[PDB]
Structure formats: structure tokens, C-alpha cells
CSV table of C-alpha atoms and ligand atoms in Angstrom, one decimal:
chain,number,residue,atom,x,y,z
A,1,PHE,CA,0.3,0.3,-0.5
A,2,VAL,CA,1.4,3.6,-0.5
A,3,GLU,CA,4.2,4.3,1.0
A,4,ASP,CA,5.5,3.3,3.3
A,5,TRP,CA,2.1,2.6,4.5
A,6,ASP,CA,0.5,0.3,5.3
A,7,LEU,CA,-4.0,1.1,5.4
A,8,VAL,CA,-4.4,-1.5,8.7
A,9,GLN,CA,-8.3,-0.7,9.2
A,10,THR,CA,-11.3,2.1,8.8
A,11,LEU,CA,-12.8,5.2,10.2
A,12,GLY,CA,-15.3,6.3,7.9
A,13,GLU,CA,-16.3,6.3,4.6
A,14,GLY,CA,-19.4,6.7,2.5
A,15,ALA,CA,-19.1,11.6,2.3
A,16,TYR,CA,-16.8,11.9,-1.5
A,17,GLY,CA,-14.6,8.1,0.0
A,18,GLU,CA,-13.5,6.0,2.7
A,19,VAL,CA,-10.6,7.6,5.5
A,20,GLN,CA,-8.4,4.5,6.3
A,21,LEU,CA,-5.6,4.0,9.5
A,22,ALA,CA,-2.6,3.8,7.9
A,23,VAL,CA,0.7,3.0,10.2
A,24,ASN,CA,4.1,3.0,8.7
A,25,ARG,CA,6.2,-0.6,9.0
A,26,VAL,CA,9.0,1.1,9.9
A,27,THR,CA,8.4,3.8,11.5
A,28,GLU,CA,4.8,2.7,13.5
A,29,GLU,CA,3.6,6.5,13.1
A,30,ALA,CA,-0.8,6.4,12.7
A,31,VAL,CA,-2.1,9.0,10.5
A,32,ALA,CA,-5.5,8.9,8.4
A,33,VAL,CA,-6.1,8.9,5.3
A,34,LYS,CA,-8.3,9.9,3.3
A,35,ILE,CA,-8.5,7.7,-1.0
A,36,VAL,CA,-10.6,9.9,-3.2
A,37,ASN,CA,-12.5,21.0,-6.5
A,38,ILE,CA,-10.5,18.8,-5.1
A,39,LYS,CA,-7.7,21.0,-5.6
A,40,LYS,CA,-9.9,23.6,-3.9
A,41,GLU,CA,-9.8,22.0,-1.5
A,42,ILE,CA,-6.2,21.1,-0.9
A,43,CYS,CA,-5.1,24.2,-0.3
A,44,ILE,CA,-7.7,25.1,2.5
A,45,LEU,CA,-5.8,22.3,4.1
A,46,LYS,CA,-2.7,23.1,3.5
A,47,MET,CA,-3.8,26.1,5.0
A,48,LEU,CA,-4.5,24.8,8.3
A,49,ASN,CA,-1.8,25.1,11.3
A,50,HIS,CA,-4.3,24.8,15.2
A,51,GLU,CA,-4.9,23.0,18.0
A,52,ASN,CA,-8.3,21.9,16.7
A,53,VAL,CA,-8.6,21.7,13.9
A,54,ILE,CA,-7.4,18.6,12.0
A,55,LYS,CA,-3.6,18.7,9.8
A,56,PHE,CA,-2.4,17.8,6.9
A,57,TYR,CA,1.1,16.2,6.0
A,58,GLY,CA,0.0,15.9,2.7
A,59,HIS,CA,-1.2,13.6,-0.8
A,60,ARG,CA,-0.4,11.2,-3.5
A,61,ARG,CA,-2.5,10.8,-6.9
A,62,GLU,CA,-1.7,7.3,-7.8
A,63,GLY,CA,-4.0,7.3,-11.0
A,64,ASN,CA,-7.4,7.4,-10.6
A,65,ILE,CA,-6.9,7.9,-7.2
A,66,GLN,CA,-6.0,10.8,-4.4
A,67,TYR,CA,-4.9,10.5,-1.6
A,68,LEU,CA,-5.1,13.0,1.5
A,69,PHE,CA,-3.0,12.4,4.9
A,70,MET,CA,-4.1,13.8,7.6
A,71,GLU,CA,-4.3,14.2,11.7
A,72,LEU,CA,-5.2,11.0,13.2
A,73,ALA,CA,-7.7,11.0,16.1
A,74,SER,CA,-7.6,8.9,17.9
A,75,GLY,CA,-11.1,8.8,20.1
A,76,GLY,CA,-13.7,8.9,17.3
A,77,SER,CA,-16.1,11.5,17.2
A,78,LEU,CA,-18.2,13.8,19.2
A,79,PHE,CA,-21.2,11.9,17.7
A,80,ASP,CA,-20.2,8.7,19.7
A,81,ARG,CA,-20.3,10.9,23.1
A,82,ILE,CA,-23.4,12.4,23.3
A,83,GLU,CA,-26.2,9.6,24.1
A,84,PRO,CA,-29.8,9.4,23.4
A,85,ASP,CA,-32.5,12.2,24.6
A,86,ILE,CA,-29.9,12.5,27.7
A,87,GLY,CA,-26.2,14.0,26.2
A,88,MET,CA,-23.4,14.4,27.8
A,89,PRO,CA,-22.4,16.2,31.3
A,90,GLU,CA,-22.7,20.6,31.3
A,91,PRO,CA,-18.1,20.6,32.4
A,92,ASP,CA,-18.2,18.0,29.2
A,93,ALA,CA,-20.6,20.6,26.6
A,94,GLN,CA,-18.3,23.3,27.8
A,95,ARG,CA,-15.0,22.0,27.9
A,96,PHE,CA,-16.3,20.8,24.5
A,97,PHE,CA,-17.7,23.9,23.8
A,98,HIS,CA,-14.0,26.6,23.8
A,99,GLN,CA,-12.7,23.8,21.7
A,100,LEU,CA,-14.5,24.8,18.4
A,101,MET,CA,-14.8,28.0,19.5
A,102,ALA,CA,-11.1,28.6,19.0
A,103,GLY,CA,-11.0,26.5,16.0
A,104,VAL,CA,-13.9,28.5,14.3
A,105,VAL,CA,-12.1,31.8,15.7
A,106,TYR,CA,-9.1,30.1,14.0
A,107,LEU,CA,-11.4,29.5,10.5
A,108,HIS,CA,-12.8,32.6,10.3
A,109,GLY,CA,-9.2,34.3,11.1
A,110,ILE,CA,-8.3,32.9,8.1
A,111,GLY,CA,-11.1,33.9,5.8
A,112,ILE,CA,-12.4,30.1,6.2
A,113,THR,CA,-15.5,28.8,6.5
A,114,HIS,CA,-16.2,25.2,7.3
A,115,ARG,CA,-20.1,25.1,6.5
A,116,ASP,CA,-20.4,21.8,7.3
A,117,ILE,CA,-20.5,22.3,12.0
A,118,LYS,CA,-22.5,18.7,13.3
A,119,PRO,CA,-20.7,15.7,16.0
A,120,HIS,CA,-20.1,13.8,13.2
A,121,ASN,CA,-17.1,16.3,11.7
A,122,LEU,CA,-15.3,17.1,15.1
A,123,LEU,CA,-13.2,14.4,16.7
A,124,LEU,CA,-11.8,13.6,19.3
A,125,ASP,CA,-7.8,12.7,20.1
A,126,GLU,CA,-6.4,11.2,22.6
A,127,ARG,CA,-7.0,13.6,25.0
A,128,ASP,CA,-10.1,14.0,24.4
A,129,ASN,CA,-8.8,17.9,22.5
A,130,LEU,CA,-11.9,18.0,20.0
A,131,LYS,CA,-10.9,19.1,15.9
A,132,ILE,CA,-13.0,20.3,13.2
A,133,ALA,CA,-12.2,18.0,10.1
A,134,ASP,CA,-14.0,17.2,6.7
A,135,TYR,CA,-13.0,20.4,5.0
A,136,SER,CA,-14.4,18.5,1.8
A,137,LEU,CA,-17.6,22.2,2.2
A,138,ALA,CA,-15.4,24.7,2.9
A,139,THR,CA,-14.5,28.2,0.5
A,140,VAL,CA,-12.5,31.1,1.2
A,141,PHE,CA,-15.1,34.6,2.8
A,142,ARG,CA,-13.1,37.1,3.0
A,143,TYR,CA,-10.0,38.2,1.1
A,144,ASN,CA,-7.7,40.3,0.3
A,145,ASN,CA,-10.1,41.9,3.6
A,146,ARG,CA,-12.4,41.6,1.8
A,147,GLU,CA,-15.9,39.8,2.3
A,148,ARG,CA,-18.2,38.7,0.0
A,149,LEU,CA,-21.0,36.3,0.3
A,150,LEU,CA,-22.3,33.1,-0.3
A,151,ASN,CA,-25.6,32.3,-2.2
A,152,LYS,CA,-24.3,28.0,-2.8
A,153,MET,CA,-27.0,26.5,-0.1
A,154,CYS,CA,-24.9,23.9,1.6
A,155,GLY,CA,-24.9,21.6,4.4
A,156,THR,CA,-27.1,19.4,6.8
A,157,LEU,CA,-31.0,20.7,7.3
A,158,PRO,CA,-30.2,20.6,11.3
A,159,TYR,CA,-27.2,22.2,11.6
A,160,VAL,CA,-28.1,24.9,8.2
A,161,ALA,CA,-29.9,28.6,9.9
A,162,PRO,CA,-32.6,29.5,8.3
A,163,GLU,CA,-31.3,32.7,6.2
A,164,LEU,CA,-29.4,30.1,3.5
A,165,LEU,CA,-33.2,28.3,3.0
A,166,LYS,CA,-34.2,32.6,2.6
A,167,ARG,CA,-31.3,34.4,1.3
A,168,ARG,CA,-29.8,35.1,-2.7
A,169,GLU,CA,-27.0,35.3,-0.5
A,170,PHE,CA,-25.8,35.2,3.6
A,171,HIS,CA,-23.3,35.8,5.1
A,172,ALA,CA,-21.1,33.2,6.1
A,173,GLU,CA,-19.4,34.2,9.7
A,174,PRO,CA,-23.9,33.4,10.9
A,175,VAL,CA,-23.9,30.4,9.5
A,176,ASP,CA,-21.2,28.8,11.5
A,177,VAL,CA,-22.3,30.0,15.0
A,178,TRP,CA,-26.4,28.3,14.2
A,179,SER,CA,-24.8,24.8,13.6
A,180,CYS,CA,-21.7,25.6,17.1
A,181,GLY,CA,-25.7,26.3,18.8
A,182,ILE,CA,-27.5,23.2,17.9
A,183,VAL,CA,-23.5,21.6,18.3
A,184,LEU,CA,-24.1,22.9,21.9
A,185,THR,CA,-28.3,21.6,21.6
A,186,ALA,CA,-27.4,18.2,21.0
A,187,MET,CA,-24.0,17.7,24.0
A,188,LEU,CA,-27.0,19.6,26.5
A,189,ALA,CA,-30.3,17.0,25.3
A,190,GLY,CA,-28.9,14.6,23.0
A,191,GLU,CA,-31.4,15.7,20.4
A,192,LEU,CA,-31.6,17.3,18.4
A,193,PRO,CA,-35.0,20.2,17.9
A,194,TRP,CA,-35.8,20.5,14.2
A,195,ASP,CA,-35.8,18.3,11.0
A,196,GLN,CA,-35.3,22.6,9.7
A,197,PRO,CA,-34.9,25.8,10.0
A,198,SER,CA,-37.9,26.5,8.2
A,199,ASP,CA,-41.3,28.3,9.4
A,200,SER,CA,-43.3,25.1,7.7
A,201,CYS,CA,-41.6,23.7,11.1
A,202,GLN,CA,-43.7,23.6,13.9
A,203,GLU,CA,-40.6,23.3,16.7
A,204,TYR,CA,-38.7,26.2,14.8
A,205,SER,CA,-42.6,28.1,15.2
A,206,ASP,CA,-42.5,27.1,19.5
A,207,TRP,CA,-39.2,28.6,20.5
A,208,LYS,CA,-39.4,31.7,18.4
A,209,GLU,CA,-42.5,30.7,20.4
A,210,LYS,CA,-40.3,31.0,23.1
A,211,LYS,CA,-41.8,27.8,24.0
A,212,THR,CA,-39.2,26.5,26.5
A,213,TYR,CA,-41.3,23.9,29.0
A,214,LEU,CA,-41.0,21.6,26.0
A,215,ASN,CA,-37.8,19.2,24.7
A,216,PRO,CA,-35.3,19.5,23.7
A,217,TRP,CA,-35.5,23.2,25.7
A,218,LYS,CA,-36.0,21.7,29.1
A,219,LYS,CA,-33.7,19.1,29.8
A,220,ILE,CA,-31.2,22.3,29.2
A,221,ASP,CA,-30.9,24.6,32.8
A,222,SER,CA,-31.5,28.1,32.6
A,223,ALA,CA,-28.3,29.8,32.4
A,224,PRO,CA,-26.3,27.4,28.5
A,225,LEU,CA,-30.8,27.8,27.6
A,226,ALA,CA,-29.9,31.6,27.8
A,227,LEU,CA,-26.4,31.7,25.5
A,228,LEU,CA,-28.6,29.5,23.2
A,229,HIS,CA,-31.5,32.5,23.3
A,230,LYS,CA,-28.6,34.6,21.6
A,231,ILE,CA,-27.5,31.4,19.1
A,232,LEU,CA,-30.1,30.8,17.6
A,233,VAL,CA,-31.4,34.2,16.3
A,234,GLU,CA,-33.8,34.0,13.1
A,235,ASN,CA,-32.3,37.7,12.1
A,236,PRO,CA,-28.3,36.6,11.1
A,237,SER,CA,-28.0,40.2,12.3
A,238,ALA,CA,-29.6,39.9,15.4
A,239,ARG,CA,-27.7,36.8,16.3
A,240,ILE,CA,-25.0,36.7,19.2
A,241,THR,CA,-20.2,36.5,17.4
A,242,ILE,CA,-18.2,35.2,18.5
A,243,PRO,CA,-16.1,37.5,20.2
A,244,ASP,CA,-19.7,38.6,22.4
A,245,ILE,CA,-19.9,34.4,23.4
A,246,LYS,CA,-17.2,34.4,24.6
A,247,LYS,CA,-18.4,36.9,27.3
A,248,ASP,CA,-21.6,34.8,28.0
A,249,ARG,CA,-22.3,33.8,31.7
A,250,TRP,CA,-22.5,30.4,31.1
A,251,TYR,CA,-19.7,30.0,28.5
A,252,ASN,CA,-17.2,31.4,31.6
A,253,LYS,CA,-18.9,29.2,34.4
A,254,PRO,CA,-16.3,27.5,36.1
A,255,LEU,CA,-17.7,24.4,35.8
A,256,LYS,CA,-15.2,20.9,35.8
A,257,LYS,CA,-12.0,19.6,37.4
B,301,TWK,C1,-13.4,9.5,11.2
B,301,TWK,N1,-13.4,9.9,10.5
B,301,TWK,C2,-12.9,11.1,9.8
B,301,TWK,C3,-13.9,11.4,9.4
B,301,TWK,C4,-14.1,12.8,9.0
B,301,TWK,C5,-15.8,13.2,8.1
B,301,TWK,C6,-15.9,12.1,7.4
B,301,TWK,C7,-15.4,11.5,7.8
B,301,TWK,F1,-16.7,9.9,6.5
B,301,TWK,C8,-14.8,10.7,8.6
B,301,TWK,F2,-14.7,9.5,7.4
B,301,TWK,C9,-11.5,11.1,9.9
B,301,TWK,C10,-10.6,13.7,8.7
B,301,TWK,N2,-10.9,13.6,8.7
B,301,TWK,C11,-10.7,11.2,11.2
B,301,TWK,C12,-9.4,11.6,10.7
B,301,TWK,N3,-8.1,12.3,10.3
B,301,TWK,N4,-8.8,10.4,12.1
B,301,TWK,C13,-9.1,9.6,12.5
B,301,TWK,N5,-10.4,9.2,12.1
B,301,TWK,C14,-11.7,9.9,11.0
């Protein structure tokens, strides 16, 4: 198998192609390999250097198949740490949220939007450090200090911001903030609040009407729920920004040893 690397186990599939564990017969160093536009993805992957983003090691083409070598996350995904109908202990949810914001602030700072934040795309290293993975939908929204609005509809319906179903064009950053809000909801309640944030979605109307005696909102303590009230705001220019998320009372609440 490719160069010194043996492809010894599968970690995920479907998507565009498969992800393999690559143990180096020589050094025993273990990495991840994605087996697959791709030009643009590679170019974004080479920009990424942060502790909460999956590191890119290199690519080797071999006829049809490209091979993307990235940092391995041996802890699996945040999706596997969320217990259905329960979620996880509030202190673990807060730490993962801190790491997720650190990663999102980095991407936005280099003018990159991920566009598909959800628990399947948030992986853990062996010390339970969160890493944003899968840059196949990622795009430049800021270049030479000029912002460009996005127009492609993409992501996963339960995680997408409402403006992306309703507007011709929209700002990248509030879309990623919204999906972090759905991720925070899943961690604290082990359930997604709606199929999609459309006015024909009863659960979404129930939330705009502030009916928080229904699930999933009734499983969530008042402090983190006050933050979700500022994140899941339908008007993207009134929605809270990451600088202001970092001032939020629950965000700054001591919880974890
Ligand atoms: C499961 N998995 C993925 C993955 C991420 C998104 C979709 C998908 F299908 C995947 F396999 C990784 C990546 N990128 C990954 C890694 N780097 N290390 C360990 N396991 C991984």
C-alpha cells in the first residue's frame, strides 16, 4: 500500500470516499488517509495550522485515486459521546464548546468557513481534544480583507441557519455560529430541536414563540439555555458573534476539574 504506509483499518466512508488508518511499517507512526474541487480542498487543507483543526500532512495521486494524509483522531467523534435523550455532563459540553469556538475563530481568522459543523465532523484525539474535520464543503469568504457573501446552499438541514433557506446571498460567519448552537443543544439534550429551521417546521415555530417547557429546551439548565437564546436568533445580523459568545455568563462559568 502507498509508499511506506499500510492501510490497516477503516474509520469512516460514504461522504465522498473512505478514511483509513495508516500505520507506517518502518516508524509505526499512525495517521489517517482519505481515499478520493479536490484542488480547492487540498489548497485550504495546506492553510490549516491550529490545535482544534485536523492537520494536513500531504497528498499523493496514483492514477484515479488521490490520498489525503491528515492527523489521526484516535478518540473517534463527538457524535459517539452524545447519549440519545440525555446528552453528556454539562462540564464536558462546556470544554468541547470552548475547543469548538477556538477552532471556529481560527478558521474565520484565515477567512475560511467550514459550512458543515456537526458532531460527525468534530473528532477527538487521545486526550479528548476536539478537532474540526472534513474541509470538502469549506470555502474562502474573506480575501485581501474583503468579505464575499455566499450563495451555495450546503450543509445538513438540522444544523443549517434559516437565512440559507430564505436568502439569495448571506454572510458566512453567522451560519457557522448557528450550527455551533445546534451542536451545543445536542451535547446538552441528546436530541436535535428540529428537522430544519423553516416556518413550516412546528418545532422551529415553537422555539420562535419561546415555548421552552417543551423538549429539548426543558432538559437544559437556565445558564446555557440563555446562551442558546442569543445563538439561535432568526435574524443573522442580530445573532450573537463569537467575541460576544466569549463574554456570556455560562461560557465563563467554572464547572470542570
Ligand atoms: C472517522 N474519521 C474522519 C471522517 C470525518 C468526516 C467524515 C468521515 F466519513 C470520516 F471518516 C476523519 C477525518 N478527516 C478522521 C481522522 N482524521 N482520524 C480518525 N478518524 C477520522
